[PDB]
Amino acid sequence: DIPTKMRVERWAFNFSELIRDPKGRQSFQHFLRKEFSGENLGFWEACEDLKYGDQSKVKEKAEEIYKLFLAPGARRWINIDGKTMDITVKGLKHPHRYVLDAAQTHIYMLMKKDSYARYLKSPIYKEMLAKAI
Amino acid sequence: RTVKLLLLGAGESGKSTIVKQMKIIHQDGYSLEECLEFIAIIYGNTLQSILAIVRAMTTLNIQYGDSARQDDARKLMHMADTIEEGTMPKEMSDIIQRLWKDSGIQACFDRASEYQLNDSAGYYLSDLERLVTPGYVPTEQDVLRSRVKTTGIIETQFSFKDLNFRMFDVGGQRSERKKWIHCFEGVTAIIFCVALSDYDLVLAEDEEMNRMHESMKLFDSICNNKWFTDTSIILFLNKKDLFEEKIKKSPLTICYPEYAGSNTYEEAGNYIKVQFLELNMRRDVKEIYSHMTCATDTQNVKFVFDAVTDIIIKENL
Amino acid sequence: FGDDIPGMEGLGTDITVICPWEAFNHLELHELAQYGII
Ligand SMILES: Nc1nc2c(ncn2[C@@H]2O[C@H](COP(=O)(O)OP(=O)(O)O)[C@@H](O)[C@H]2O)c(=O)[nH]1
Ligand code: ALF
Ligand SMILES: [Mg+2]
């Protein structure tokens, strides 16, 4: 999959277009890894998977997500406030489809306001525009 | 020669603001199109700020000066969910302006140390009319005052005094510190930012932990670390302008129970400086330089950064 | 490999949460690369 020029330029229209695009998220990830903030995209996808994946795996998936992104000192510990975390940790006691909505929104805005802006000005994105068919 | 400089500190201590000043002072500065990009950030900061105060009204059980505001508050919360993030519709700003003028909201705003409120809440809210005036263009101060939580490690480069700076900006929250180790190699100098006005606040990550106590533990660990024996360490006691105002109404004893001095800028400020500097249990050998700063003041930052460069120059023999 | 370093049992939150890099205080900077921490 090689994005056309119009498609890649569209990633700059707004964050929603970039992250809602498979190739966009892949390009954005290369950038986040560069800034050591890849856990945010990892967490966002884990949430999307939990919500629209096999609804019988919710419990397992939620436990795994907690262990990887929420537990104090987690390998991919995410940057959310105490309240949001409290809300999430309580909800996880009794898992469900949208139990990570609060945390996911916070992390979404985190990337949009901070990482996204720099992404559009990075060499990585300029190159995506270059190789654009 | 090249200089690797690290900006370290707890969350919201002023690091990224210092980076913006480097852009304004030692780089290209901000263009019109660049400033326009901060509008959504500012509108976002403004709405989040008023919403936090409105929520604290119930949390601290403070009554509105006028009951008609109770309805305005309800409507603001509703709109907050429907409006496009980063926008400030006429109907929303009119509501915010009325709430801001309410004596109850003001009483709540003055008790901000009791909840979580953006530093620039007052700055933006007190001048909301200017911000929503057709043709509004963020000034440099409006940009410096903006708030965006940083995640990750970000590098910026510039030359000064014939030195090539590679300045690293990191996020300060607990979860972000797991990443700090990644830029600890070959560090020429470290600027550790402490928010002086944090003495009566608690962490956004842990509502039970006093913010200044957290900074102290961080500085203690950083200034006594083996990896930085040859590193120049400079302490920036930031937000002196906010501290100057806060010390008039909030006792330093909230942080240091034993403090017996007067609650004045000079005395309290020096006391805090001393509590941090004495964490250096190698004070004999190497000295830690410190400066009272206001990161949103371009002239102050220009001056202090000049003195930091001198140190680095002097230290590199 | 930064999470495969031994000797983490017994240390308090001051290290595991507040000052994470302290878990590697027994290592020299050149060893951090060698052991895949950085
Ligand atoms: N009044 C005032 N605000 C400041 C000062 N320093 C940072 N701020 C504001 O405090 C908030 C946090 O600063 P920021 O640089 O993002 O902190 P960082 O969290 O350490 O990166 C922003 O809204 C800044 O404009 C200061 O010295 N005085
Ligand atoms: F609170 Al920060 F960088 F420390 F946004
Ligand atoms: Mg920052």
Side-chain angles (χ1 to χ4, degrees), chain A residues 79, chain B residues 9-16 147-152 169-173 176 180 211:
Chain A
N79 195 346
Chain B
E12 313 184 74
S13 58
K15 284 115 61 223
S16 290
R147 169 64 182 163
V148 171
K149 183 159 68 170
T150 310
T151 186
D169 186 34
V170 309
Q173 287 70 33
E176 301 292 352
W180 289 20
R211 295 204 173 192

Side-chain angles (χ1 to χ4, degrees), chain B residues 233-276:
Chain B
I233 299 178
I234 302 75
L235 176 70
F236 273 24
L237 298 157
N238 197 47
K239 302 188 182 173
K240 63 186 180 184
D241 63 310
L242 293 181
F243 176 71
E244 194 168 51
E245 307 303 346
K246 171 171 294 192
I247 193 65
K248 299 174 179 174
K249 302 188 296 177
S250 183
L252 182 59
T253 49
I254 288 179
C255 183
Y256 306 104
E258 301 190 300
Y259 182 60
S262 73
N263 289 129
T264 57
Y265 178 74
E266 292 188 62
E267 206 166 309
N270 284 316
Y271 193 76
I272 296 175
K273 179 194 59 187
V274 169
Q275 304 310 298
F276 272 83

